[PDB]
Enzyme design. Sequence first.
Site, PDB file in Angstrom:
ATOM      1  N   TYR A  96      17.076 115.427 -19.613  1.00 16.07           N
ATOM      2  CA  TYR A  96      15.729 115.614 -19.103  1.00 16.07           C
ATOM      3  C   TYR A  96      15.100 116.933 -19.569  1.00 16.07           C
ATOM      4  O   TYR A  96      13.981 116.944 -20.060  1.00 16.07           O
ATOM      5  CB  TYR A  96      15.769 115.578 -17.577  1.00 16.07           C
ATOM      6  CG  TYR A  96      14.457 115.857 -16.895  1.00 16.07           C
ATOM      7  CD1 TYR A  96      13.466 114.883 -16.835  1.00 16.07           C
ATOM      8  CD2 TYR A  96      14.210 117.095 -16.292  1.00 16.07           C
ATOM      9  CE1 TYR A  96      12.259 115.126 -16.203  1.00 16.07           C
ATOM     10  CE2 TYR A  96      13.002 117.346 -15.644  1.00 16.07           C
ATOM     11  CZ  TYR A  96      12.036 116.353 -15.602  1.00 16.07           C
ATOM     12  OH  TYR A  96      10.829 116.576 -14.967  1.00 16.07           O
ATOM     13  N   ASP A 113      14.495 125.111 -10.582  1.00 14.42           N
ATOM     14  CA  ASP A 113      15.869 125.231 -11.083  1.00 14.42           C
ATOM     15  C   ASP A 113      16.025 126.057 -12.370  1.00 14.42           C
ATOM     16  O   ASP A 113      17.121 126.595 -12.662  1.00 14.42           O
ATOM     17  CB  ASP A 113      16.440 123.835 -11.313  1.00 14.42           C
ATOM     18  CG  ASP A 113      15.586 123.016 -12.276  1.00 14.42           C
ATOM     19  OD1 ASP A 113      15.894 123.024 -13.485  1.00 14.42           O
ATOM     20  OD2 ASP A 113      14.586 122.406 -11.826  1.00 14.42           O
ATOM     21  N   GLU A 135       6.198 127.648  -9.019  1.00  9.79           N
ATOM     22  CA  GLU A 135       7.055 126.853  -8.140  1.00  9.79           C
ATOM     23  C   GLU A 135       6.682 127.153  -6.681  1.00  9.79           C
ATOM     24  O   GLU A 135       6.644 128.318  -6.273  1.00  9.79           O
ATOM     25  CB  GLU A 135       8.527 127.185  -8.426  1.00  9.79           C
ATOM     26  CG  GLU A 135       9.529 126.801  -7.330  1.00  9.79           C
ATOM     27  CD  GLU A 135       9.685 125.316  -7.167  1.00  9.79           C
ATOM     28  OE1 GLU A 135      10.154 124.652  -8.131  1.00  9.79           O
ATOM     29  OE2 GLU A 135       9.331 124.811  -6.079  1.00  9.79           O
ATOM     30  N   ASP A 141       7.080 119.669 -14.362  1.00  9.13           N
ATOM     31  CA  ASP A 141       8.422 119.276 -13.972  1.00  9.13           C
ATOM     32  C   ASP A 141       8.463 119.180 -12.452  1.00  9.13           C
ATOM     33  O   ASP A 141       9.131 119.971 -11.764  1.00  9.13           O
ATOM     34  CB  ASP A 141       9.429 120.278 -14.520  1.00  9.13           C
ATOM     35  CG  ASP A 141      10.848 119.984 -14.088  1.00  9.13           C
ATOM     36  OD1 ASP A 141      11.140 118.866 -13.613  1.00  9.13           O
ATOM     37  OD2 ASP A 141      11.684 120.890 -14.221  1.00  9.13           O
ATOM     38  N   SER A 142       7.703 118.212 -11.943  1.00  9.65           N
ATOM     39  CA  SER A 142       7.547 117.978 -10.517  1.00  9.65           C
ATOM     40  C   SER A 142       8.653 117.085  -9.979  1.00  9.65           C
ATOM     41  O   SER A 142       9.306 116.355 -10.729  1.00  9.65           O
ATOM     42  CB  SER A 142       6.223 117.265 -10.264  1.00  9.65           C
ATOM     43  OG  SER A 142       6.237 115.975 -10.879  1.00  9.65           O
ATOM     44  N   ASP A 164       9.048 113.969  -6.852  1.00  7.20           N
ATOM     45  CA  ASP A 164       8.306 112.721  -6.607  1.00  7.20           C
ATOM     46  C   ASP A 164       7.023 112.893  -5.751  1.00  7.20           C
ATOM     47  O   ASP A 164       6.867 113.908  -5.064  1.00  7.20           O
ATOM     48  CB  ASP A 164       9.252 111.673  -5.995  1.00  7.20           C
ATOM     49  CG  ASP A 164      10.448 111.366  -6.893  1.00  7.20           C
ATOM     50  OD1 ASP A 164      10.257 111.134  -8.113  1.00  7.20           O
ATOM     51  OD2 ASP A 164      11.587 111.353  -6.382  1.00  7.20           O
ATOM     52  N   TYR A 222      18.896 109.571 -12.380  1.00  8.00           N
ATOM     53  CA  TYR A 222      17.566 109.239 -11.860  1.00  8.00           C
ATOM     54  C   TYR A 222      17.513 107.735 -11.600  1.00  8.00           C
ATOM     55  O   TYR A 222      18.222 106.980 -12.275  1.00  8.00           O
ATOM     56  CB  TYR A 222      16.473 109.702 -12.818  1.00  8.00           C
ATOM     57  CG  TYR A 222      16.256 111.211 -12.837  1.00  8.00           C
ATOM     58  CD1 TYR A 222      16.684 112.029 -11.780  1.00  8.00           C
ATOM     59  CD2 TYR A 222      15.590 111.817 -13.897  1.00  8.00           C
ATOM     60  CE1 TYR A 222      16.462 113.421 -11.796  1.00  8.00           C
ATOM     61  CE2 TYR A 222      15.376 113.213 -13.929  1.00  8.00           C
ATOM     62  CZ  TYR A 222      15.808 114.001 -12.879  1.00  8.00           C
ATOM     63  OH  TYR A 222      15.582 115.370 -12.921  1.00  8.00           O
TER      64      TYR A 222
END
Lengths: 281, 281
Positions: A62, A87, A107, A156-157, A159, A224
């Site tokens: 990813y 992260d 973030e 890079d969210s 859901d 995922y």
Amino acid sequence: KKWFSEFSIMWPGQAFSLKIKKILYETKSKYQNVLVFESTTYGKVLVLDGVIQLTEKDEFAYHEMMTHVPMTVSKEPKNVLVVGGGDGGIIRELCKYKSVENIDICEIDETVIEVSKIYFKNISCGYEDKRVNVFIEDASKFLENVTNTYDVIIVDSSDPIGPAETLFNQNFYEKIYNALKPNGYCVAQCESLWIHVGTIKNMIGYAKKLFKKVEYANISIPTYPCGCIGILCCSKTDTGLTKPNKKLESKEFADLKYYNYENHSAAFKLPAFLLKEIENI
Amino acid sequence: KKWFSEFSIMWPGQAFSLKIKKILYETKSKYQNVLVFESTTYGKVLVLDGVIQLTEKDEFAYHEMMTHVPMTVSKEPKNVLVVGGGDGGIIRELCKYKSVENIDICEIDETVIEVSKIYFKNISCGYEDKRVNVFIEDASKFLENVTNTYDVIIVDSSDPIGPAETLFNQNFYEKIYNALKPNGYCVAQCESLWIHVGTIKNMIGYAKKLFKKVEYANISIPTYPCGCIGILCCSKTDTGLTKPNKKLESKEFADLKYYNYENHSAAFKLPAFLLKEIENI
Ligand SMILES: C[S@@H](CCCN)C[C@H]1O[C@@H](n2cnc3c(N)ncnc32)[C@H](O)[C@@H]1O
Ligand SMILES: C[S@@H](CCCN)C[C@H]1O[C@@H](n2cnc3c(N)ncnc32)[C@H](O)[C@@H]1O
């Protein structure tokens, strides 16, 4: 030994489970439930609101594709923004680019960053890089207020249920459009082709309102839902994101585990049912 | 409502689960445990010895790629063999080819065929085709004894634990080599790149002993472990299976849901870690 099981209304009737070796950390932050465990076979696992966000075993798939797709197309990107990505995996891949002069990360949940710095040191190592600037803020607000424009924005969210609810809409994509340089690119986490086709259609619809080139790529990643996730790729120029403009040949990229020159374009070659769905958009 | 959960020593520490709407059929055949259920979101599901073999939702991805990859490369295939594939999905895709004069299927477990004919009528419809000939036999024995040679052999086996144990070895690939025409192709179900890399290396090793071109392709399918499965592609000529020699343009193929001309070659573009592993073989 117990098992962690990932259930969700977002993927009804299916669940993926990992065997727990040991629980490492658990808390309820201001925004979400946070869980870190050592799995028996996927290494360490970060879970946010009951959803697997990353594992040591496959995270590179990813993070490499999300980063190296736009970064090999952008000719000389100097300023890059990451939305979400607490992260630090994306940031880790961005630091490999010597041309980059600044990386902003926005973030919302500082707990995510702090947990990553403690528990995921091979993912969060990029935070040590002097080019990296951290903003603890809703990206929705950050994008309304930012004065700089970026060569690349990587979304890079998590859901649509949770803090990332502000990031799935038409006004958000306007803010991304405005925060980008005239020739800028945005890539954004977009759901799995196997379950979220109406959503993919919606997102492409929003993007095509503003961007002159909207494309969709798929990534293979076993942890995922449905074992894959899409990248919504948006361009301001006619040429799009399917073809890299460089090869990653220097010592910084020797260690890549998923991305390569040929994988880049291959990821845009979609199953027939999906192309069919996203044609009259 | 209860859930079906897929555990296995072949993929330790992980499990995929589907919610059961209703159990349709259960038996212990001469070779394996057979289970058919209606899931809540994946339609009907066939399970053999606790392993998901197919679901209505995604089966087309595996059956189209396994069939249309070798069949678009073979110029005018007349005789095709299927090893395993008792459900008839491959046969359904093979019947679309008017040039085909004969399809042999060698399936060890007639219960699988009969269950598919009853419960999976949109998968097993090909059995009605006059070109189809069924042999209830271990493929291991069938391949030692067959007098005909085939343009294409498709090995649509289950996993190495169970009746398909005879199909994962070097002697098996010799029998495939001998059952093929001078210019013939074999494709074979090969495990997931995310967990079985030592096995992929072994199989490629066995194949390269005999075939002058051995390639590996990957398919996205959410109900197989890790959400994908590989195709071991073996050729007797120098040219291999990465490039189709025809497009599927006639009315028989209008309905394809995964395969297309560009997906064909894209499936052979593998993640960097796998290429690295399968280089000095
Ligand atoms: C962990 S990351 C998932 C895969 C790892 N690359 C998802 C991050 O997005 C953050 N997130 C969610 N919503 C927002 C908003 N609105 N703004 C900024 N960051 C957000 C969320 O807190 C996770 O840390
Ligand atoms: C159902 S199919 C899996 C995906 C659907 N295309 C797997 C079939 O291979 C058969 N099988 C397994 N071993 C053998 C041997 N040795 N010979 C023939 N067929 C076999 C097994 O009975 C399943 O029906």
